[PDB]
Amino acid sequence: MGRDEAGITGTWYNQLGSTFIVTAGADGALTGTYESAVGNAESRYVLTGRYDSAPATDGSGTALGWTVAWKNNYRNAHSATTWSGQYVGGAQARINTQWLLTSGTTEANAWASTEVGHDTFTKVK
Amino acid sequence: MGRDEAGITGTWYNQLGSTFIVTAGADGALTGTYESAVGNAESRYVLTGRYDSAPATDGSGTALGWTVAWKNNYRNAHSATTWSGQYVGGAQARINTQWLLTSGTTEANAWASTEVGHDTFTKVK
Amino acid sequence: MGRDEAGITGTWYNQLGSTFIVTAGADGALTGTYESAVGNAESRYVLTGRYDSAPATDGSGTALGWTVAWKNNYRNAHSATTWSGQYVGGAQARINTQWLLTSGTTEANAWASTEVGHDTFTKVK
Amino acid sequence: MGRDEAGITGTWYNQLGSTFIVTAGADGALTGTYESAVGNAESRYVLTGRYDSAPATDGSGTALGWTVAWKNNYRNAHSATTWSGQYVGGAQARINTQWLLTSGTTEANAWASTEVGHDTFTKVK
């Protein structure tokens, strides 16, 4: 199995109250759904990503990332967010991320297409 | 089909000489391989991502993102990059992105875990 | 007198244990020193920046930013960090930032020149 | 004098048509004005920043950064941009930057407070 396949798989919550449900595959795949508590979003959206399935054994975290395009059967916000971060295991497991949210824009507005932020996910709350 | 399924699917090159080979699915999926011309990387890596399969019809671009974890059969750089951006169609089609590259780190180096940059992909190298 | 001139001026600490000493001028200037608890840094470095001296009155925060170039009489890390963020007043006043740390690099390494992160500053600890 | 004091001082233009007028001081100071061709901006705004006044001699660029708060006598966009980057000298001198644009927001919208982008400045056009 991947080293943190079991630790990453499951339900995660971030500081905004969003819910990140993910399955880690033994080869590096991430698949799941994301539900945002904020923004132009309702219900669940497909996500897909990748993770390092053989991380360093020196106490380092486990690099990973995933993408949501904000289109589902309810809404289309013409945008996509990618989260890039690392998983840290243990009693208070965390996924610490930074993210890039790009909107489809006209060429005149493309300088302002992308927001950046940071989300921390925990297995509780 | 996704509105830009045909325009996104194929081989792309960025300004560093990296090669991004992608298939866009009608529902929003992106799958393919990435080969970086720079960094701790050799040969192809799996990528997965998502795109807006029903973008605005007002001349706006098409939001999308994808992830590579930098582990393959040759190397493991204990890191993952996510690209977030928009596809702009037409005779000089482009995918304009910004990206976040996170390494697995110890908690002491985690403040320095993530680089940020920008890549532009075209259909011609 | 800037609206938050009095609230911003003083000593601030972030989650890494770094110390940010700043004076806010009535026109929008920020001047002070920064001492980082981490990285290739020792003792204090000059900082300068700007803040919105007439913020919105609707409960919004106060936008601001500043720069440190990591050269002083002790060390030169050939890099500079800019923090961009907002000040939020009140009993638990905070400056919430994201930052970009760029190193001087060769053109071959320039794709990897810049790290991104987030710091939260408070008046205590 | 700073090593690139003479090369940095002067008028610069980015890809959007904005105009950056700056004086570099021998100790590391940057002072000047910024005029944006885009966004909620009119005429010139104060800027201040810092640069590495003793960069590496191995052909590396020169790290620097600066801030604009988007308030002047004409408009107040309740926001600030910081540019972080490096100066590269020579016949086609360039300042290559990434930037963070933070607006003052309510706490409910703070997740969306910050845009990120990249500007390249040249001495011509």
Ligand SMILES: O=C(CCCC[C@@H]1SC[C@@H]2NC(=O)N[C@@H]21)NCCCCCN(Cc1ccccn1)Cc1ccccn1
């Ligand atoms: O909303 C969506 C889809 C849902 C995304 C959820 C994000 S994903 C990272 C995170 N993690 C989570 O769990 N949830 C959030 N797309 C469109 C975004 C357009 C950006 C528009 N505005 C923000 C804004 C919000 C409210 C009122 C006004 N303006 C950008 C902006 C930036 C700076 C200054 C001003 N405005």
Ligand SMILES: O=C(CCCC[C@@H]1SC[C@@H]2NC(=O)N[C@@H]21)NCCCCCN(Cc1ccccn1)Cc1ccccn1
């Ligand atoms: O290399 C990889 C896997 C490949 C990624 C390729 C990227 S993906 C975005 C892009 N698009 C492309 O096509 N290719 C590139 N991971 C490890 C990254 C560790 C970062 C270490 N150093 C950079 C460095 C380079 C050379 C010598 C020394 N240090 C970070 C850093 C930040 C600032 C200052 C100094 N160092």
Ligand SMILES: O=C(CCCC[C@@H]1SC[C@@H]2NC(=O)N[C@@H]21)NCCCCCN(Cc1ccccn1)Cc1ccccn1
């Ligand atoms: O250190 C300085 C001056 C001090 C800055 C302090 C920052 S300012 C934002 C913050 N807030 C604070 O208060 N303090 C910190 N410049 C040089 C930066 C070189 C980056 C090299 N490496 C990081 C690293 C650390 C340890 C061992 C190896 N490599 C980049 C990198 C990126 C990703 C993956 C790997 N490496």
Ligand SMILES: O=C(CCCC[C@@H]1SC[C@@H]2NC(=O)N[C@@H]21)NCCCCCN(Cc1ccccn1)Cc1ccccn1
């Ligand atoms: O404008 C200013 C002051 C001037 C700044 C100039 C920047 S400084 C980096 C650069 N370099 C330059 O030279 N010029 C630009 N502040 C307020 C920003 C509010 C953001 C609102 N919007 C963008 C937007 C524009 C038009 C219509 C709609 N939305 C954010 C957004 C983001 C993502 C998706 C959707 N909306």
Ligand SMILES: [Fe+3]
């Ligand atoms: Fe907007």
Ligand SMILES: [Fe+3]
């Ligand atoms: Fe490093």
Ligand SMILES: [Fe+3]
């Ligand atoms: Fe490095």
Ligand SMILES: [Fe+3]
């Ligand atoms: Fe907005």
Ligand SMILES: [Fe+3]
């Ligand atoms: Fe908006």
